[PDB]
Amino acid sequence: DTHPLLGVGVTDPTNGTRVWESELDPDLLWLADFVIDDLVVLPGAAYAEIALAAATDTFAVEQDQPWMISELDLRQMLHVTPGTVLVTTLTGDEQRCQVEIRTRSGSSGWTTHATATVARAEPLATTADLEDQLDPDDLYQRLRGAGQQHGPAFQGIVGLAVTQAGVARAQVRLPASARTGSREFMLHPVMMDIALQTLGATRTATDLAALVVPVRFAGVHVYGDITRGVRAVGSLAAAGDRLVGEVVLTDANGQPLLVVDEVEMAVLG
Amino acid sequence: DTHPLLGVGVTDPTNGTRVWESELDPDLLWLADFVIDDLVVLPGAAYAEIALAAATDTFAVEQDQPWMISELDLRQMLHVTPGTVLVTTLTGDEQRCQVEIRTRSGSSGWTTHATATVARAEPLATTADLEDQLDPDDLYQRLRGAGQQHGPAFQGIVGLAVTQAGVARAQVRLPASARTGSREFMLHPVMMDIALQTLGATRTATDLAALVVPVRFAGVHVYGDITRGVRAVGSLAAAGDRLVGEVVLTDANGQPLLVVDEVEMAVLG
């Protein structure tokens, strides 16, 4: 009925700006399973869902996945505490619009956690690279001792390996404790996170370990219900000092469900 | 809990503007008793309540009647139909703010019905003029055959007379079918209307009769719960072609509860 993360919306008449508000609570759905330094945090994947959910609620469209996310900047983490209120704005047209996502302090104070640009979706267009099998329980234990406390709902990497070139290949499910409310989302945050987790298994990321979290997306393309995905493939390079990656999520028939052109990564104390 | 006319509010973060929305329905409270040309209409008094209710919901204040209404312009009538959505904006500070009240067409179309300026309240500062007693049932029958179909809830003028100078003096109650929800209001719309009805008994107004409705208020001062009022005194002059009046509502001890410095009146087809 109502989106659990975005909430209900009203268009301000003074300007074309549409404004949403929703109440977040750690006992909400599966938010409790995402934890950094013992703090329940809203995962960066979730801002993508909110942006897309916002665009779909403003404009009449006839499709299933009509939007791509041009850009998405993660400004500062959202410590999910009880009585957290999430305020979201949208401004633009059916071709291109900007979304801003915030926490609310009282009634007239806001802290913006992320900004996204949504636009009309673009339609989808044996070698010396052998795999070395890896234990998923090794990964979820490395970053569990580095701050990232992924719970049951976020432990979707069930098979993992990495090529000679350094690319990470993972087999992924959406865990049983995360398919409640799944139908509410266009781009299931938990699943997108699971796709993004693979980047932490690349040779680039592992040659560091502190943990390494996302801070920017560009070119998030959704071509279907990403929960139907089963194999995620992520590569992480380094250009400048910025860690820039790319991941691809494909269903059982190797069809792309989610494609993320860029993912800028960074370290966290 | 929630104001039946103003509704629930959210502050848009892009600008300081606060935005309310509420659902109006003719079977709402006593809206059905106010009728013009067989159409349920929101009475002009109600926009005053909405403006004050809006100001009180934006700002922290310690009083009972902290606001006066500097001005209030009635732009076009609101035909109350089922599923009517009333959108209200507020912009300013605790000293002076502007309110705009609208109907909503869909999700991105509005029709503004009234605009008001609210400001900090200013604190309260035998002759040849004999009365001629009048029948209240004569008044409510004159304007009932001219378009104004006041129902049970709006028939508060229970005693009426008019001086030699042309001033109208009325004894007023708040009818039994209108004290449901009374506690929700700061400035009970039905009562304010009843105060304003007196102007239709002045020598100026009667020397016309079509009916004569308000279109502008200035200097609406509220000094208490106006339902405690019992005697309303209204005078209507004519300067230029505009019909400009003034009414005063006083409680049992002759203490002013409501004072309206100006009321511009006009005819309606």
Swiss-Prot record, chains A, B:
Chain ranges of the PKS/mFAS DH domain: 3-269
Stretches the record annotates as N-terminal hotdog fold: 3-125
Region of interest: Dehydratase: 3-157
Active site residues of this protein: F34 (proton acceptor), D193 (proton donor)
Source domain of life: Bacteria
Region (C-terminal hotdog fold): 131-269
Subunit structure: Homodimer.
Functional note: Part of the PpsABCDE complex involved in the biosynthesis of the lipid core common to phthiocerols and phenolphthiocerols by successive additions of malonyl-CoA or methylmalonyl-CoA extender units. PpsA can accept as substrate the activated forms of either icosanoyl (C20), docosanoyl (C22) or lignoceroyl (C24) groups from FadD26, or a (4-hydroxyphenyl)-C17 or (4-hydroxyphenyl)-C19 fatty acyl from FadD29. PpsA initiates the biosynthesis and extends its substrate using a malonyl-CoA extender unit. The PpsB and PpsC proteins add the second and third malonyl-CoA extender units.
Misc remark: Was identified as a high-confidence drug target.
Protein name: Phenolphthiocerol/phthiocerol polyketide synthase subunit C
Gene, per the UniProt record: ppsC
